[PDB]
């Protein structure tokens, strides 16, 4: 904390609630391929360690374009082709089925 | 509810996941070995298995056993996510010693995220050392050994009223105890004073007054970091702190030559403390 | 259903005051004075003249620059009132100062004169210089208006100077002099450069 | 107070893996002062007095061409008392890929200490 | 049971007035006992 | 004692840094740079279960720069057979001898 | 690069500087030039009684430009 | 700039309705020891940041000594808001206040 | 070949039209080569190339022709091209900016960057930077913050400050409304080399160079010509050494050019409707701001005395100037007894001040002393020690500075005394505050060795007295510390040899 | 002058490259490693 | 001092129309531009232009991430000072789907 570097804004309550399926306006990395990593250690494209989401290993990522310490990292999303349940609320589910 | 929602029943079913960012999932090494995160292995097993059933639906739709091929697939995605947020959930193996806790179990200890890294932090600007008795310091005083004291900085605004004990500070820098580590400019930047030598700190030490050209930060003024002198206060603490009178603001005397912080017998009762090699927490 | 879920996005987007003309003389009025309302902080150096530290620190690098929020370039300030932090005018207010940091925050109503063009909008301008790709303006002798051959009549060419460039002609065989009235294309922020984009024709 | 640490190149290295890395010193690979606190074999001259942060031995593998040292990392300085070092039984006729090194840190009694 | 209350404030959708000792913690408030149970405000001088 | 990293900023010089506090690094002229993390889990063979083995290794004060396969492998077994001499694979060789 | 780092240097965007937010407040009312001759008097003769020396620059080309001929 | 002349004028008279006047409040007259505390504290974080001090110092150094100088002549120029837990406030001075 | 490649670079801006961009990467690539790399274009087709891009603006500037212009910016050497070329590149420059001024950006980078060489390169750098300062009135904004960001480094060779700090002013010259953030950028990054430099002098008694002849060194540079994938962690031989006898050179060099350009500026025909109101203005406020809080620091407050004394009114008004500060009630106590620690070393010090103008300081400084004699006389035996009265104890001190080195200008051949002087300091050091003990060990006794002499007030009685008696290390050093003691540069103090009053 | 010495037999011992780490007296495994004449210095306190 | 301060302040940037931490981004400039704060989930991209009588974006609402995909919106973002491990909760709560929405009123 520095005493010269002001904030105005404040955060004064919190919302609980559910992220819907429409993270395609949030995320557009698209995290697919199950292999991480391959030979000569650069992160593959739709893997896991994927540019998108973040910098890593020296590399400027492929969203924010910063390095490692400037770089918030970012959300990627899995598609799951069927819906399967949340595992938090499947026993509200099997309440109202 | 006035935002006038509807109560949907995509609400209860996971249609996509969310992957958090690569730094929350770097990778966790152990030893002077790099291994791989352990949230990826439980969200690798989900991504197989969904490569696994992207092929099976183009086979079933260019033309029996591609339905058990499928519907066994439907008990482990299920599980496979239901192994990613909780842990207990899923049998899985059921050999014992279940890997990748998951994001329920993340959250849910003593430890935890919500009680460890929340509500209980570790902090900069704080030593801990044993405990010797004193007669000689005050009863609202504390000794502080000239090993604390030329860590424990404290980022002094520099004003025209402190410029005669900070320019002073500069020049004894990081040697002398009555001294200084770092100055702050006014656009933020640091300047450390530790490789220097007495004539660079001595030209440094007459430019804490003089105003920047740069504009949008001609309000601030310099920040010395100075050792702990005698009028800063400290909060002292003990190991099981039950009462309130087991953690307070103590004034700071230093006494040279000594490697302990040093306590009067006032303080003795309040902490519940003998003085029998008991560390105590110190706080600046 | 979407004239209500998206139609917030054209109000986002409809622009709020379009620019008039006056004496009848094409050029369109975009001199505008629009009413806002800041909140900005105070340092401690002018908790005795509050309303300097207000003008120094926000509004006054806030000035021939262009603002988001007001569609303009701010030619200036008017009528600073601090709002009090105490619904009690008079001289004696007061801000409220933040727990972490010693600056204060308050609400300012201040009445700003910026200058607005929008697309579709008639101006004048001095010709400052043109060769065979472009003219390059300067409305109302501070901003740049570059008026490029494709939005340039074909019906007009371009000699050649002979050393020192080169000058204009028009259908009339008239040299043509700075005075130019022209038609808004498009306002580029691309930079700390206002850039107004123009065409001659209609 | 005594104290030994066993240093074992043979410790990351696989069971059908060739010899890597070797005790002693690379050759026209030189940063100086680390002939100091070692002998020509990468061993310690003992009777040295180390501090944390210093070269405690120094070897030259074949997998990165780097001469590296091990660090002595304690915040009590020692000497080096004794340098052993260890032959090969199971894979015999085969270099030294084992050395315990045995420190002494004095102890004066300090303010603090319990009698 | 930090994931049962969670899926109860998730399916209340609760808004957490951010009042309690435990809850500005976590947001990173000022307490609102002793020192932050008020507001300082500085006089200025001028209008 | 100075070791290398990224280049220094603040219109000083391109260079290599140093240490401070063991994880946050200055120049050499006193400027100091932003923020090194120095990715750490702690212990308590044992220290849990035993989970996977890959082939990475940190060496660069936080994240890693080490172990990334056969990047000089082309030229470690063209170096291995020429230390030791005389392997006696001769053919017009020997006549001379 | 040496023009890719401190991105901070650039930015200039602290609350210091700029207000946190802005919001009009009514309409934009169009002035006349008989104002704007009126306000860019009381103006640029006010601020002249330290920055603003660049802006007050470029006002009077504003100020002459309603009223003469360069 | 219809909704936020609409919201701001809800806000400040969401805000008037919970002053308390001059002669209505009925908090106690003295210094709470919590605002004392960050009296101090708030003042001497200003006279830090080059603040207009209003009191001879003679040569002290301190920040909140300073600030503690200038509580015994009555010389902050501060105002405490008491709040009350539906959220209605009372302004009080540090110039009124009885500083114990 | 100068019929067949203007069809190449005419239809290359075809293939900008066809939208594929591969004849971009390859004709705007060899630009980008250095200068001294030989494979380049040469002056030929740059004449064919650029009046390709001059008449046809409007088809180069999608975002993948970024290249196309990326690598007309590091054209580097574009200021040694002939003059048929030369004004054909600054004429591309001048329709780029004036079509989209997005790229002034960018270009007014480099221009700044290069005024590290001297004024006779550069004489084509400014005209380009002063025609867009003309044009675009927005440009005096972030032009403004990239000299701040390209200023030479004091790890820079000796001729980077010299020339850019001599290009900058002449930059001053032409934009008058840029000069109060062209002063306050030199005299800031003149005290950065000058405080480093008086702890390098040596104590109370200098001595003299031990150098029968001086070396300039013209004649001090080589010429002006001018990794595999890493480096590895490196070792020893830090040798953080220091130009000793370097910085004072720099400083020889930059204070004197400062000294040199603004005695051109200031002049009695410049007072009248000039620049002479601006300079002697700017430097003054920046006097007060900026080198009067640096503590102790000799050697550059002579450029405001080297303006000061061009004219008698320019006296006049910093005279009243430094009596404003020494006696404003509002400021510090530090802010005054420093002002007034420059106020009796000004008088002294000074060769071209008038006799008028010496007496007036002293009629304000003895007014200020007599008013003093109720107001507070009767406060010393009262509570609080006689730190109260340390600004009675500087006022006094900075009279008593200048009875040590201006005696004989009150003085007429009958002996009749300035504001009875022979009246004045005998019944001062009577009073109860006793100022023979509180001020300084030697001014107030070469007081003591002159007063004797020239018949005013005898003290040798006194300070015998007063050290047979026996929170201030900051007061001490204050009346120690004197502005205009001799200067250790010494290729300014020729130019101070006309202006400065020595010992004798 | 190269110098260990052997744990069993005490017979000072040089130690080449390409050998095997045992005594050339005893046939013992374990060869521990001598002090030559080399200055350390320490306070008589 | 002792939780916020001297543990693990920062100061996030947080979108004040969806009130979330996690969904901003700094934008990649046009190279004449001065980068700044966009939300990612309230931005539009640049291909839906629905179609005064015509609406053109005001060229300032237009930004573009490392990649290329140019955006339309994205703005209201502020600064606010939270705790590092409000954003790892904030992640961590997301891979459960569970929403957090910070309401930033000090406006
Ligand atoms: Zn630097």
Redesign the interface.
Same mark, same amino acid.
């Given at each position: 904390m520095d005493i010269s570097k002001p904030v105005g804004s404040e955060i004064t309550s919190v919302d609980f609630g559910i992220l819907t399926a429409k993270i395609r306006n949030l995320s557009a990395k698209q995290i697919t391929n199950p292999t991480v990593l391959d030979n000569l250690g650069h992160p593959v494209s739709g893997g896991l360690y994927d540019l998108a989401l973040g910098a890593f290993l020296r590399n400027l990522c492929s969203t924010c374009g910063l390095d490692e310490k400037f770089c918030p990292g970012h959300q990627g999303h899995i598609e799951l082709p069927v819906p399967c349940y949340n595992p938090l609320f499947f026993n509200q589910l099997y309440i109202y089925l | 509810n006035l935002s006038r929602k509807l109560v949907k029943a995509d609400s209860f079913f996971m249609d996509v996941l969310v992957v958090p960012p690569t730094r929350f999932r770097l990778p966790s090494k152990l030893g002077e070995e790099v291994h791989e995160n352990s949230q990826n292995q439980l969200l690798s097993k989900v991504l197989t298995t969904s490569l696994l059933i992207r092929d099976l639906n183009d086979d079933l739709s260019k033309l029996r056993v591609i339905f058990s091929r499928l519907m066994n697939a439907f008990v482990t995605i299920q599980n496979d996510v239901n192994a990613f947020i909780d842990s207990t959930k899923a049998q899985g193996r059921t050999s014992g010693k279940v890997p990748i806790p998951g994001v329920k179990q993340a959250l849910e200890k003593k430890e935890g995220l919500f009680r460890k890294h929340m509500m209980g932090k570790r902090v900069n600007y704080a030593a801990r050392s044993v405990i010797s008795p004193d007669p000689n310091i005050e009863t609202n005083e504390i000794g502080v050994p000239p090993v604390f004291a030329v860590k424990l900085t404290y980022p002094e605004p520099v004003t025209a009223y402190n410029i005669a004990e900070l320019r002073q500070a500069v020049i004894n820098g990081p040697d002398k105890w009555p001294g200084a580590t770092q100055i702050q400019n006014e656009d933020g930047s640091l300047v450390s004073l530790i490789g220097m030598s007495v004539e660079q700190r001595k030209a440094l030490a007459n430019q804490l007054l003089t105003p920047s050209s740069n504009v949008s930060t001609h309000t601030l003024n310099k920040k010395v970091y100075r050792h702990i002198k005698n009028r800063d206060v400290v909060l002292m603490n003990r190991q099981p702190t039950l009462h309130k009178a087991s953690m307070m603001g103590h004034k700071v005397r230093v006494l040279p030559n000594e490697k302990t912080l040093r306590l009067h017998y006032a303080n003795t009762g309040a902490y519940n403390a003998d003085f029998d090699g008991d560390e105590m927490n110190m706080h600046f | 259903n979407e004239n209500r879920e998206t139609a917030r996005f054209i109000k986002k987007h409809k622009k709020q005051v379009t620019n008039p003309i006056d004496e009848k003389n094409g050029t369109s009025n975009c001199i505008v004075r629009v009413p806002i309302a800041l909140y900005v902080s105070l340092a401690p150096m002018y908790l005795e003249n509050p309303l300097q530290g207000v003008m120094k620190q926000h509004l006054n690098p806030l000035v021939m620059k262009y603002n988001n929020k007001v569609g303009g370039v701010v030619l200036g300030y008017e009528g600073l009132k601090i709002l009090d932090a105490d619904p009690l005018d008079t001289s004696e207010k007061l801000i409220k100062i933040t727990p972490d940091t010693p600056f204060g925050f308050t609400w300012c109503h201040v009445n700003l004169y910026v200058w607005q063009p929008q697309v579709g909008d008639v101006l004048e301008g001095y010709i400052f210089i043109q060769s065979a790709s472009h003219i390059g303006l300067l409305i109302h002798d501070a901003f740049n208006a570059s008026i490029k051959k494709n939005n340039i009549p074909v019906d007009w060419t371009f000699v050649h100077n002979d050393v020192e460039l080169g000058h204009w002609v028009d259908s009339n065989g008239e040299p043509i002099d700075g005075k130019l009235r022209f038609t808004v294309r498009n306002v580029h922020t691309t930079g700390r450069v206002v850039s107004v984009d123009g065409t001659l024709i209609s | 107070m005594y104290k030994t640490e066993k240093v074992d190149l043979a410790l990351n290295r696989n069971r059908g893996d060739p010899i890597t890395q070797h005790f002693g010193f690379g050759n026209d690979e030189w940063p100086k002062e680390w002939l100091e606190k070692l002998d020509e074999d990468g061993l310690p001259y003992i009777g040295t007095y180390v501090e944390e942060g210093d070269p405690i031995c120094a070897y030259f593998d074949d997998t990165l061409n780097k001469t590296k040292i091990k660090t002595y990392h304690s915040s009590e300085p020692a000497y080096i008392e004794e340098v052993n070092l260890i032959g090969d039984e199971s894979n015999k006729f085969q270099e030294l890929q084992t050395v315990s090194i045995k420190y002494r840190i004095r102890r004066t009694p300090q303010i603090g200490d319990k009698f | 049971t930090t994931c049962q209350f969670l899926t109860k404030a998730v399916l209340d959708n609760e808004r957490e007035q951010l009042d309690s000792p435990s809850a500005r913690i976590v947001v990173g408030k000022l307490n609102n006992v002793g020192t932050g149970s008020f507001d300082v405000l500085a006089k200025v001088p001028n209008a | 004692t100075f070791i290398r990293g990224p280049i220094c900023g603040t219109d000083n010089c391109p260079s290599r840094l140093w240490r401070i506090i063991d994880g946050r690094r200055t120049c050499q002229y006193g400027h100091v740079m932003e923020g090194d993390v120095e990715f750490n889990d702690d212990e308590d063979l044992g220290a849990g279960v035993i989970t996977r083995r890959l082939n990475l290794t940190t060496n660069a004060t936080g994240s890693f720069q080490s172990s990334q396969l056969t990047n000089s492998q082309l030229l470690q077994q063209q170096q291995r057979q020429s230390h030791k001499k005389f392997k006696k694979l001769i053919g017009h060789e020997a006549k001379l001898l | 690069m040496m023009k890719g780092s401190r991105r901070t240097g650039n930015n200039t965007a602290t609350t210091l500087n700029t207000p946190v937010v802005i919001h009009a407040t009514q309409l934009p009312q169009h002035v006349s030039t008989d104002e704007v001759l009126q306000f860019l008097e009381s103006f640029i003769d006010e601020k002249e009684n330290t920055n603003l020396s660049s802006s007050i620059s470029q006002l009077k080309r504003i100020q002459r430009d309603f009223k003469g001929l360069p | 700039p219809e909704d936020f002349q609409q919201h701001e004028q809800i806000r400040r008279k969401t805000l008037k309705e919970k002053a308390i006047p001059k002669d209505q409040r009925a908090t106690t007259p003295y210094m709470t020891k919590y605002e004392r505390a960050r009296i101090l504290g708030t003042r001497a974080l200003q006279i830090s940041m080059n603040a207009p001090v209003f009191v001879d110092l003679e040569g002290e150094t301190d920040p909140l000594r300073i600030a503690m100088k200038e509580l015994a002549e009555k010389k902050i120029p501060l105002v405490i808001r008491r709040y009350l837990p539906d959220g209605s406030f009372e302004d009080w001075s540090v110039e009124e206040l009885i500083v114990d | 070949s100068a019929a067949m490649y203007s069809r190449f670079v005419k239809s290359a801006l075809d293939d900008l039209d066809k939208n594929d961009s591969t004849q971009i990467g390859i004709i705007a690539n060899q630009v980008a080569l250095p200068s001294k790399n030989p494979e380049r274009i040469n002056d030929k087709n740059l004449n064919i190339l650029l009046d390709i891009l001059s008449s046809n603006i409007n088809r180069i500037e999608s975002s993948r022709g970024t290249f196309l212009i990326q690598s007309i910016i590091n054209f580097e050497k574009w200021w040694e091209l002939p003059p048929h070329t030369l004004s054909k590149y600054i004429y591309f420059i001048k329709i780029l900016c004036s079509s989209i001024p997005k790229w002034w950006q960018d270009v007014s980078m480099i221009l700044v960057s290069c005024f590290i060489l001297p004024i006779k390169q550069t004489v084509c750098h400014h005209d380009m930077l002063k025609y867009f300062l003309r044009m675009i009135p927005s440009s005096m904004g972030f032009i403004d913050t990239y000299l701040a960001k390209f200023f030479p480094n004091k790890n820079d060779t000796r001729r980077k400050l010299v020339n850019y700090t001599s290009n900058l002013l002449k930059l001053r010259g032409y934009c008058s409304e840029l000069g109060f953030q062209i002063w306050s950028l030199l005299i800031e990054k003149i005290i950065s080399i000058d405080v480093e430099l008086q702890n390098e002098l040596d104590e109370l008694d200098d001595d003299v160079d031990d150098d029968d002849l001086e070396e300039v060194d013209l004649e001090d540079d080589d010429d002006l010509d001018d990794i595999e994938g890493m480096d590895g962690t490196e070792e020893y031989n830090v040798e953080l050494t220091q130009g000793i006898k370097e910085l004072s050179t720099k400083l020889d060099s930059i204070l004197t050019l400062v000294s040199t350009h603004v005695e051109e500026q200031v002049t009695p025909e410049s007072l009248e409707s000039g620049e002479g109101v601006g300079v002697f203005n700017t430097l003054t406020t920046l006097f007060k701001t900026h080198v009067l809080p640096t503590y102790y620091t000799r050697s550059i407050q002579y450029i405001m005395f080297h303006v000061s004394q061009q004219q008698l009114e320019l006296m006049d008004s910093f005279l009243v100037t430094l009596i404003d500060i020494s006696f404003a009630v509002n400021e510090a106590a530090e802010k005054k007894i420093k002002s007034l620690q420059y106020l009796g070393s000004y008088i002294a010090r000074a060769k071209k001040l008038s006799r008028t103008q010496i007496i007036f300081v002293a009629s304000y400084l003895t007014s200020w002393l007599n008013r003093y004699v109720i107001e507070r006389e009767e406060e010393v035996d009262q509570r609080g020690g006689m730190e109260r009265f340390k600004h009675f104890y500087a006022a006094f001190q900075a009279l008593c500075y200048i009875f040590c080195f201006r005696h004989n200008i009150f003085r007429d051949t009958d002996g009749n005394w300035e504001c009875e002087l022979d009246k004045f300091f005998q019944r001062m050091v009577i009073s109860k505050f006793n100022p023979l003990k509180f001020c300084n060990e030697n001014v107030m006794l070469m007081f003591a060795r002159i007063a004797q002499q020239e018949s005013v007030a005898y003290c040798f009685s006194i300070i015998e007295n007063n050290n047979n008696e026996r929170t201030r290390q900051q007061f001490i050093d204050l009346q120690s510390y004197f502005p205009y003691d001799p200067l250790f540069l010494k290729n300014y103090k020729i130019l101070m040899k006309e202006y400065y009053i020595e010992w004798s | 002058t +190269?110098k260990?010495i052997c =744990?069993e037999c005490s017979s000072k011992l040089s130690?080449s !490259?390409?050998? =095997? /780490? %045992?005594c050339k007296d005893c046939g013992h %495994?374990? +060869? +521990?490693? =001598? %002090?030559?004449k !080399?200055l /350390?210095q320490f306070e008589a306190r | 001092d002792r939780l916020l301060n001297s543990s693990d302040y920062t100061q996030a940037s947080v979108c004040r129309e969806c009130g979330s931490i996690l969904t901003t981004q700094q934008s990649v400039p046009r190279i004449g531009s001065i980068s700044t704060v966009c939300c990612r989930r309230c931005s539009m991209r640049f291909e839906d232009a629905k179609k005064g009588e015509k609406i053109f974006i005001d060229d300032s609402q237009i930004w573009e991430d490392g990649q290329g995909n140019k955006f339309v919106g994205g703005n209201e973002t502020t600064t606010v000072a939270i705790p590092f491990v409000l954003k790892y909760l904030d992640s961590e709560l997301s891979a459960m789907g569970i929403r957090l929405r910070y309401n930033v009123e000090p406006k």
């Open positions: - | - | - | - | - | - | - | - | - | +190269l260990y =744990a130690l !490259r390409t050998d =095997a /780490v %045992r %495994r374990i +060869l +521990l490693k =001598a %002090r030559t !080399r /350390v | -």
